[PDB]
Amino acid sequence: VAAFLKNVWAKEPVLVASFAIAGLAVILPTLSPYTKYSLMINRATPYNYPVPLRDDGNMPDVPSHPQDPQGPSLEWLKRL
Amino acid sequence: KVKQDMPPVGGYGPIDYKRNLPRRGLSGYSMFAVGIGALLFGYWSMMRWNRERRRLQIEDFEARIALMP
Structure with missing residues (x-):
């Protein structure tokens, strides 16, 4: 283990470092705290016109006037 | 007269033959430390800057979507 890695890192540093970049590149996306942010960002960019629905006879939320807060808020991106 | 053959007062001073190839001290692993640092x-x-550019992205899509009707 220690001697094996010392010897493969003595002979072929390019290949060892390559496996390091590889493995760390595999694991790190799982642990890091910032992950969810990227997803929520990517979902926060509309490409397609938001299309209204019949309001009356519904449960009130995501209200008419765009200022009325009841809908989702990306303000967390406004300051981050 | 006297003789005009060459040799002067002895020794011509010292001369240095031996090899010299010194001086690079910046290299421990610490070269990695400064490069990897630059990455960091x-x-x-x-x-x-990419966050900012996303902010601009949303703002531009807002221009368009406000236009659509």
Whole structure:
């Protein structure tokens, strides 16, 4: 283990470092705290016109006037 | 007269034959430390700038979607 890695890192540093970049590149996306942010960002960019629905006879939320807060808020991106 | 053959007062001073190839001290692993450091800067700044550019992205899509009707 220690001697094996010392010897493969003595002979072929390019290949060892390559496996390091590889493995760390595999694991790190799982642990890091910032992950969810990227997803929520990517979902926060509309490409397609938001299309209204019949309001009356519904449960009130995501209200008419765009200022009325009841809908989702990306303000967390406004300051981050 | 006297003789004009060459040799002067002895020795011509000293001369240095031996090999010399010194002086590079910046290299421990610490070269990695400064390079990898530079990476660690790049990802920081670039992270920031991409966030900003996303902010601009949403703002532009807002221009369009406000236009649509």
